[PDB]
Amino acid sequence: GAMAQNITARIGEPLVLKCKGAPKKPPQRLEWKLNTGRTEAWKVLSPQGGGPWDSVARVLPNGSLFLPAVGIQDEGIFRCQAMNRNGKETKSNYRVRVYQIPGKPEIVDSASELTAGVPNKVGTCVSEGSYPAGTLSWHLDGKPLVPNEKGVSVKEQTRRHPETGLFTLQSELMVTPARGGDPRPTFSCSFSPGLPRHRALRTAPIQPRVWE
Numbered sequence: 442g443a444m445a446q447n448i449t450a451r452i453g454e455p456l457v458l459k460c461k462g463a464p465k466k467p468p469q470r471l472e473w474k475l476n477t478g479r480t481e482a483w484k485v486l487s488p489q490g491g492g493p494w495d496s497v498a499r500v501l502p503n504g505s506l507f508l509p510a511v512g513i514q515d516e517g518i519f520r521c522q523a524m525n526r527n528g529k530e531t532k533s534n535y536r537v538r539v540y541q542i543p544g545k546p547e548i549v550d551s552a553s554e555l556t557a558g559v560p561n562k563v564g565t566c567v568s569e570g571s572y573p574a575g576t577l578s579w580h581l582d583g584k585p586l587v588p589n590e591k592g593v594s595v596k597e598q599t600r601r602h603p604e605t606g607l608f609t610l611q612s613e614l615m616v617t618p619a620r621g622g623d624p625r626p627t628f629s630c631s632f633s634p635g636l637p638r639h640r641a642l643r644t645a646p647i648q649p650r651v652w653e
C-alpha cells in the first residue's frame with residue numbers, strides 16, 4: 442500500500458484516529474475511507490454520519506474518527522482527507538492492527554521427578570485469551586530451550602474461542618536430561634506476543650528432581 446502510520450489497538454478499548462489538517466470544528470470538508478474486515482473494499486464515512494455504521498465508528502466534532510470498542514474485524518486501513526479553510530488538502534493514512542493480551546501463562550501438569558538419559562514429560566503450559574495467537578516457549582535455568590536440539594521436544598496446540606475469536610495455546614515439553622547435570626533444574630514457560638514491542642509474560646518456575 443501507501444506510507445502509513447502503524448496503529449496497534451487493543452480489543453475492547455476505544456480508538457481515536459486523528460484527521461490531520463482539518464478545521465477544529467464544523468463546518469468541515471473532510472472524508473474518512475476505511476477498508477477493514479467489516480467492509481467490502483472501501484467504505485466512506487462523513488461528519489453527518491447515520492445508518493448502522495454509527496454503532497461502530499463515528500466522526501467526532503473535531504473530525505477525528507472514534508471507535509468506542511475495537512473488535513477483531515476493525516483491522517485494515519483508515520484514511521482521512523481534509524481541506525482547511527484556505528483550501529490545502531491534507532491526508533492521513535493509518536494501518537490498524539488489533540491485539541489482545543492473554544492471561545498469565547500457567548504450567549498445568551508438571552513432573553516432580555525426571556530420569557536422566559531417557560525422554561521425560563516435564564509439563565504442559567497453557568495461555569488463554571491472546572490475539573493474534575502468539576507463541577509459547579520454554580526456558581531452562583533462564584536459557585531458551587530450542588526444540589529438536591539435543592533432547593528437547595516440544596508439541597503445541599492452538600484452540601479458538603467459538604464466539605470471541607481469542608486464542609488459547611497449550612505447549613508440552615519433553616526433555617532427555619544428560620547424565621551429570623544439575624539434579625534440580627528450573628524450567629519456566631513464557632508467552633511471546635505476535636505484534637512487536639510487547640512484553641513477555643512468564644510462568645512460575647517448576648523445579649523437578651533429576652535422578653542419575
Ligand SMILES: Cc1cccc2c(-c3ccccc3)c(C(=O)O)[nH]c12
Nearest residue numbers: 443472473474520521522532533534
Ligand atoms: C495514499 C493516501 C493516504 C491517505 C488518504 C488517501 C486518499 C483519500 C482518503 C479519504 C478521502 C479522499 C481520498 C486517497 C485516494 O483515494 O485518492 N489516497 C490516500
Ligand SMILES: O=C(O)c1ccc(Oc2cccc(O)c2)cc1
Nearest residue numbers: 469470471472522523524530531
Ligand atoms: O461539501 C463539500 O464541499 C465537501 C465535503 C466533504 C469533502 O470531503 C473531502 C473529499 C475529498 C477530498 C477532501 O480533501 C475532502 C469534500 C468537500
Ligand SMILES: O=C(O)c1ccc(Oc2cccc(O)c2)cc1
Nearest residue numbers: 495496497499500501502507509
Ligand atoms: O454508538 C454510538 O451510540 C456512538 C458512538 C460514537 C459516538 O461518537 C460521536 C461522534 C460524533 C459526535 C458525537 O457527539 C459523538 C457517538 C455515538
